[PDB]
């Protein structure tokens, strides 16, 4: 009987103001969008298999450099950490700032996406990373090469790292939908590749293990959920190609969330989207910074 | 009654389409960020899901 | 103030209105967002390309129609891999194979055997970086089978003034005999033959000791000189040392051109110079070493 | 997340 | 330079 209408008329009428805002910033980024970024990548002279010959050819700045696992496949640009931990990480996955879209199908995330390198402002070469996948072959490749590890880095928007080392990593090539296996996990991050979300018990806990899964993206269903509705699909819900489960514990290449916290109303679809690493921070926390990088185990 | 019934859909109409724009202005910021990476620039711009939460919860009140 | 009940009906419908136009502009967005989608998954370009001809050399590659200047990929005979390089080509089809280059001492120069080894700075498609190839790649390039080469050495001060040293039938030893550095003769060039040595006034024998041909290939870290010290890191740098040099391509880049005694902390001449053509205490403003197949030199 |  |  009351004031009702009045609260349901001042929503509508401010939502068609969003709606106009959304409109004009989605409209202006598509003309922005006629001309691409640019960078310019002078190439180190200092080359090997990966970063860690490199760095013991003498290579001790972390940079672009130009890399050639096999006489196979031609040299390829990686970015190279001389710095972490004895240098000598080639890293295979970067997120610190939302710029690249990670949400693409099988084939990219086959070839591999993003920016390897930017200016380092004013220098010639490149020498900061930008965001990106490696790609899954020249991952598989590299990871068969030898007995390889794994350095996951994570921090949140308050400054905090934390680290998920696996002294074992492998992952097999196509034709095995790329196929995950680690071991030997050590760090402080918690072991989410192999035990799962710290935060869950038995049934529920094991089928967010992702080591021993193969690869999936929005496009290609692979992940360990079984259904029949199209749209339950680990990678459409949750953002990403990844070795999904049922889903994960751990979403490195998840939606980029400005701020960290979020909430399944934010989440296009309520999932727990985003670059999330459950056994820290939870399930609805989003990394400000997250990468993947690899070398040669001694 | 009569516009009871058109009021009710009204609610449920509105509730959801706070919770579909709220979800929107995200996936916008989003998406416009990822720009950075390959276009000549990304709109700067900031969200104020304030501003949908409070009409959130400012609807809910009236609904009962 | 609340109005009557006659206009619940069409304040009722009013909204009902906005709300599907709202939910219409929304389809509208939504499908917009989708085509700003497809427009956001190239990377950044980058302007450094790599060009696909490859070959022995850059001379090689020169041969099978490459006609503009960049980064290519080489692969001599007896190498295991293949390597990138910058390869120099003119209006005549000669494609020069560039090993040595300082133009504004933002490398330094100062490495250990290994960094000569493998190389060290950069490489650019414009030709304006800094950079040493490598003496693995220089002995690689130079030792092919029945092809003699020859090495080009370009100087320049801060006058604008450029001149040149050729040197025929140029060799890089293996790493067994320390990349020792070898030539049939001086090939001529307004630079001066700086490699044969050069009278300091300082002894009977300066000539001699600071001659390069047939010298070996000397790091801080690793000593092949003919001085019972160590020339390498007293100048802190790679070359092939005597006691010590009348040339030395590779040392301190010193900004002005002028430099002296003081400047240093031993209190040697250290600096890019060339006895020939220029004092020793006269740092050189822009270097350049490159190699090509000798039967390419002017006929 | 999972999904039971 | 010669070092003598
Ligand atoms: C496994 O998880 C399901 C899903 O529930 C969610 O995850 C739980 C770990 C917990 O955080 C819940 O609050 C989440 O909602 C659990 O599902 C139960 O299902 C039954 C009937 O289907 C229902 O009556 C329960 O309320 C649900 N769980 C509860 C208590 O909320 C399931 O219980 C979990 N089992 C394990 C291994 O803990
Ligand atoms: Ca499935
Ligand atoms: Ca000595």
Same mark, same amino acid.
């Given at each position: ?72 496949? #031609? ?108 071991? #030997? ?46 749209? #339950?699909?680990?990678? #459409? ?62 | ?64 | ?10 304040? $009722? ?23 700003? /989608? ?8 980058? =302007? ?39 390869? /120099? ?48 790649? $220089? ?14 050495? /370009? ?63 000397? =790091? ?12 390498? /890191? ?44 220029? =004092? ?20 | 997340?999972?999904?039971?």
């Amino acid at each position: 009987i009351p004031t009702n209408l009045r609260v349901l008329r001042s929503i509508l009428e401010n939502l068609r103001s969003k709606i106009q805002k959304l409109e004009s910033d989605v409209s202006a980024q598509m003309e922005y969008c006629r001309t691409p970024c640019t960078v310019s990548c002078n190439i180190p002279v200092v080359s090997g298999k990966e970063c860690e010959e490199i760095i013991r050819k003498g290579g001790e700045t972390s940079e672009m450099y130009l890399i050639q696992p096999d006489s196979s496949v #031609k040299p390829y640009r990686v970015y190279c950490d001389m710095n972490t931990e004895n240098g000598g990480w080639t890293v295979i996955q970067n997120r610190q700032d939302g710029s690249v879209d990670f949400g693409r199908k099988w084939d990219p995330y086959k070839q591999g996406f993003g920016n390897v390198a930017t200016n380092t402002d004013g220098k010639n070469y490149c020498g900061l990373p930008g965001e990106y996948w490696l790609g899954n072959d020249k991952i598989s490749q590299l990871t068969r090469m030898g007995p390889t590890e794994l350095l996951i880095e994570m921090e949140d928007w308050k400054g905090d790292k934390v680290k998920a080392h696996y002294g074992g990593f492998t992952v097999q090539n196509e034709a095995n939908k790329y196929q995950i296996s680690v071991n #030997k996990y050590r760090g402080t991050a918690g072991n989410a590749l192999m035990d799962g979300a710290s935060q869950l018990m038995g049934e529920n806990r094991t089928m967010t293990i992702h080591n021993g899964m193969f690869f999936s993206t929005y496009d290609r269903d692979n992940d360990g959920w079984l259904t029949s509705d199209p749209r #339950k699909q680990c990678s #459409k819900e949750d953002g990403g190609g990844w070795w999904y489960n049922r889903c994960h514990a751990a979403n490195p290449n998840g939606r980029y969330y400005w701020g960290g916290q979020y909430t399944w109303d934010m989440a296009k679809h309520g999932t727990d989207d985003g670059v999330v690493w459950m056994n820290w921070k939870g399930s609805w926390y989003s990394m400000r910074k997250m990468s993947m990088k690899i070398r040669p185990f001694f | 009654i009569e516009k009871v019934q058109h009021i009710q859909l009204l609610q449920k109409n509105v509730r959801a389409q706070l919770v579909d724009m709220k979800r929107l202005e995200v996936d916008i910021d989003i998406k416009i960020r990822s720009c950075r990476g390959s276009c000549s620039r990304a709109l700067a711009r900031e969200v104020d899901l304030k501003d949908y939460e409070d009409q959130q919860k400012q609807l809910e009140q009236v609904i009962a | 103030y609340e109005a009557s009940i006659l206009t619940h009906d069409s304040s $009722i419908r009013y909204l009902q209105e906005i709300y599907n136009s709202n939910n219409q502009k929304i389809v509208n967005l939504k499908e917009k967002v989708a085509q700003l /989608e497809a427009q956001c998954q190239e990377p950044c370009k980058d =302007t450094v390309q790599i060009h696909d001809i490859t070959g022995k050399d850059c001379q090689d590659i020169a041969n099978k129609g490459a006609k503009q200047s960049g980064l290519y990929f080489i692969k001599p005979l007896k190498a295991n891999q293949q390597f990138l390089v910058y390869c /120099e080509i003119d209006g005549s089809g000669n494609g020069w194979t560039v090993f040595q280059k300082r133009l504004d001492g933002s490398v330094d120069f100062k490495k250990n055997w290994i960094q000569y080894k493998e190389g060290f700075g950069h490489l650019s498609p414009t030709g304006t970086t800094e950079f040493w190839l490598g003496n693995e790649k $220089i002995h690689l390039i130079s030792t092919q089978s029945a092809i003699p080469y020859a090495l080009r050495v /370009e100087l320049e001060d801060w006058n604008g003034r450029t001149s040149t040293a050729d040197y025929a039938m140029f060799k890089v030893g293996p790493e067994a005999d320390k990349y020792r550095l070898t030539y049939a003769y001086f090939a001529g060039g307004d630079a001066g033959d700086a490699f044969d040595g050069f009278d300091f006034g300082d002894a009977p024998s300066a000539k001699f000791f600071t001659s390069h041909n047939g010298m070996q290939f000397s =790091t801080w870290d690793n000593d092949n000189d003919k001085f019972e010290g160590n020339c390498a /890191e007293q100048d802190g740098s790679g070359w092939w040392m005597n006691k010590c040099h009348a040339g030395h391509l590779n040392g301190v880049y010193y900004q002005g051109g002028t430099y002296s005694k003081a400047s240093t902390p031993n209190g040697y001449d250290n600096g890019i110079i060339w006895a020939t053509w220029k =004092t020793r205490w006269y740092s050189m403003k822009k270097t350049t070493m490159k190699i090509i197949p000798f039967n390419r030199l002017t006929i | 997340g999972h999904r039971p």
